[PDB]
Design a protein around this ligand. Structure first.
Ligand code: XKA
Ligand code: NI
Length: 158
């Protein structure tokens, strides 16, 4: 079991960390959503499904810099939403195949009314999300730590 970003950053078997750079809508209005759909950028696969079945949770998610201070919101993980920053490990997702399969985590962030100026600086860390992979076969428990960075800039217009 390993994972890769869209543009080819790779976290190997056993876990590790990676940076993932994402494009954001340039304007979000107070009352509207800024979506971060990592399921278009983070992909995983079972490396021997013949015998093994891999289980994947979002162990933990945390907000940094801009999103940490001008935004509230949730994280949708497999059809269901949860508070973000996270308060609890999410349910398991089953990684079936040797075929690359999206990590289906997306953030929905709304700006607080005091969000004025540039809410998120470009090139800043906005989120860290810890992918935790166990299985049905041995005692393996590995964290795949993704550091989410912003490409462009987002402003919230007064
Ligand atoms: C499980 C297994 N049986 C093999 C076999 C069976 N019969 C005759 C010859 N050989 S080879 C064989 C194997 O190749 C393995 C392939 N990956 C293995 N472990 C890694 O991948 C698993 C599946 O994604 C993860 O759940 C685990 O955490 C770790 O990352 S063991
Ligand atoms: Ni592989």
């Amino acid at each position: 079991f390993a994972c890769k970003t869209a543009n080819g950053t790779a976290i190997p078997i056993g876990g590790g960390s990676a940076n993932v750079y994402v494009n954001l809508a340039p304007v979000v209005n107070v009352g509207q959503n800024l979506v971060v759909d990592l399921s278009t950028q983070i992909f995983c696969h079972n490396d021997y499904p013949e015998t093994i079945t891999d289980y994947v949770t979002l162990q933990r998610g945390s907000a940094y810099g801009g999103v940490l201070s001008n935004f509230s919101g949730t994280v949708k993980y497999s059809g269901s939403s949860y508070p973000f920053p996270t308060t609890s490990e999410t349910p398991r997702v089953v990684y079936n195949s040797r075929t690359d399969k999206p990590w289906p985590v997306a953030l929905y962030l709304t700006p607080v009314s005091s969000a004025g100026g540039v809410a998120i600086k470009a090139g800043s860390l906005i989120a860290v999300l810890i992918l935790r992979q166990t299985n049905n076969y041995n005692s393996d428990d590995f964290q795949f730590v993704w550091n989410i960075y912003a490409n462009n800039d987002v402003v919230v217009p007064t």
